[PDB]
Amino acid sequence: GLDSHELARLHELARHSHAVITRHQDAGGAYPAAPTFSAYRGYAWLRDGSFTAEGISRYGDVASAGRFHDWVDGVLRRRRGQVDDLLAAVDRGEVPSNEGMLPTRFTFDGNDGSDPWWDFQTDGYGMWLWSVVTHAARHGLDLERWRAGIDVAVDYLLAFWDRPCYDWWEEHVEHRHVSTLGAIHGGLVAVGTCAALRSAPWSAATLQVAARIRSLVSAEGVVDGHLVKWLGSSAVDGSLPACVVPFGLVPPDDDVAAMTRAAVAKDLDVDGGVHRFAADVFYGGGQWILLSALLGWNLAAAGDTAGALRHLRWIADQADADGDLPEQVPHHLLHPGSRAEWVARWGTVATPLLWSHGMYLILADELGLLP
């Protein structure tokens, strides 16, 4: 379904995606979110980094992906005491405030880059577990290299998975977001079904808590046959397909998977460019490359190769003259009046966004299109 013209350009964008990710990887192994965007530069996120690492692992750069996992593992081992103290506090009946939780932004030397009162999120820890297990399985690696960091993440998530937190988009701290629950589920199932981790003391617990997550989503996170943005809401969010692939709340051919893909397409997908959520005013609510990639990935997994390809083509059309992929583009805006202020305050949209490139690599790989 691709001619030589398209294949050449898609191959080149894949090569360039690998290059921009590995060029900007920090000396210590972290992947930055966006080296030139004012509000993100200097920081690493586990969410962005884990998807980026998965794209790089699929691409076959074992060294680069391994250095990212080394970095995360070391950062988490340094939080062993913090996590133990949070768990002890829970055991005393003194539940820690959001202000005491593990961070969202990391500096490249592994310190808190932001105050979790303002951005507390648990999804990234779940994504990292999914990412590191998937990487090790793909390349035949011994997970003991990263196990002590895995242990910190697992202990943290088993304790705090059911806590309200901000969503992937740093909004609505009072709610429990289905793509956050989904990320945690994906990480817990990854470690709980990993033969190398069969003797871990938390082995059984991870699958039991994953089942608890699915119970909660079944009870409060499905409406009219589709997943919803947060428990007790009716709306969808463009992140929701991640709950199918890769995080596995339901199989790709499940009715809830089909209905969720359809609802996201209807409510949020304009010409192949997927919006985050209807109320999104960030840069006027533009079309997000990573979300078009996520939807494409899910379409491919469900057997809709044509739909996957249409989304891959849309993404490729957003590459700039150097091949860099932005965070988002404004071809369609949900709330156009809101864009100007964002541009004035933070500058033009983050480009390149490493996560855009990571997701491009994943979707290209799903379609068998890596060079």
With beta carbons less than 8 A apart as the criterion, state whether 294 and 243 touch.
no
Distances (CA, A) of 108 to 18, 27, 68, 329: 20, 9, 11, 28
Resolution of the model in angstroms? 1.4
Contacts of 85 (CB under 8 A, 6+ apart): none
Distance CA 214, CA 229 (A): 15
Instruction: Show which residues are catalytic.
Output: 167, 170, 327
What distance in Å separates the CA atoms of residue 162 and residue 216, rounded to the nearest whole number? 9
Q: Residue 49 is encoded by which pair of tokens?
A: 């980094």
- Domain spans, the chain: 1-371
Please, which residues have CB within 8 angstroms of residue 96's CB and are 6 or more apart in sequence?
86, 89, 90
User: Cβ distance 135 to 54 under 8 Å?
Assistant: yes
Task: List, in order, residues 6 or more apart from 160 with CB less than 8 Å away.
Answer: 86, 101, 122
Paired strand residues for 269: 274
Q: What gap in Å lies between CA 216 and CA 290, rounded to an integer?
A: 27
Query: Which of 318, 265, 266 shows the shortest CA–CA distance to 294?
Result: 265
Q: Per the structure block, which two tokens stand in for 115?
A: 């105050």
Query: Which bin fits 200, alpha (ψ -120 to 50), beta or left (φ > 0)?
Result: beta
User: With contact defined as beta carbons under 8 Å apart, do 88 and 126 qualify?
Assistant: no
Q: Could you give the dihedral angle defined by the CA atoms of residues 122, 123, 126 and 127, in that order, rounded to the nearest 10 degrees?
A: -150
**Angle, helix 289-301 to helix 354-366, in steps of 10 degrees:** 20
HEC profile of the chain:
CCCHHHHHHHHHHHHHHHHHHHHHCCCCCCCCCCCCCCCCCCEECHHHHHHHHHHHHHHCCHHHHHHHHHHHHHHHHCCHHHHHHHHHHHHCCCCCCHHHCCCCCEECCCCECCCHHHHCCCHHHHHHHHHHHHHHHHHCCCHHHCHHHHHHHHHHHHHHCCCCCCCCCCCCCCCCEHHHHHHHHHHHHHHHCCHHHCCCCCHHHHHHHHHHHHHHHHHHCEECCEECCECCCCCCCCCHHHHCCCCCCCCCCCHHHHHHHHHHHHHHEECCEECCCCCCCHHHCCEEHHHHHHHHHHHHHCCCHHHHHHHHHHHHCCCCCCCCCCCEECCCCCCHHHHHHHHHHHCCCCCCCHHHHHHHHHHHHHCCCCC
Cα–Cα distances (Å) from 326 to 34, 132, 286, 314, 351, in that order, read: 9, 26, 11, 13, 4
Which residue, among 371, 298, 344, has the nearest Cα to 58 in the 3D structure? 371
296 touches 308 (CB < 8 A): yes
Phi, psi of 138 (to 5 degrees): -55, -40
β-bridge partners, 230: 177
**Residue 45 to residue 58: CA distance in whole angstroms:** 20
Closest among 182, 124, 133 to 156, alpha carbons compared: 124
Scan for tokens 């003391």, then name that residue.
201
Report the alpha-carbon distance of residue 325 to residue 321 in Å, rounded.
10
Residue position matching structure tokens 């509000």: 39
Type of residue numbered 159: A
Q: Which residue has the tokens 């405030």?
A: 97
Nearest residue to 324 via CA among 114, 34, 53, 59: 34
In 3D space, the residue among 70, 55, 72, 202 whose CA is nearest the CA of residue 134 turns out to be 55
Query: Among 66, 60, 67, 63, which Cα is nearest to 17's?
Result: 60
Residue type for position 198:
R
Distance from C-alpha of 55 to C-alpha of 26, rounded to nearest angstrom: 17
What are the backbone angles phi and psi of residue 345, rounded to the nearest 5°? -80, -45
Residue 224: left (phi > 0), alpha (psi -120 to 50), or beta? left
Based on the number of CB atoms within 10 Å of its own CB, is 331 exposed (0-12), middle (13-18) or buried (19 or more)? middle
Query: Who's near 279: CB < 8 A, 6+ residues apart?
Result: 285, 334, 335
CA–CA separation, 353 and 351 (whole Å): 5
Cα separation of 249 and 183, whole Å? 9
Is residue 30 within 8 A of residue 49, CB to CB? The reply is yes
- CB burial of residue 63 (10 Å; 0-12, 13-18, 19+): exposed
Please indicate if the annotation marks 130 as binding a ligand. Answer: no
Distance, in Å, from the CA atom of 150 to the CA atom of 178, rounded to the nearest integer, reads: 23
Is 241 in contact with 301 (CB distance < 8 Å)? no
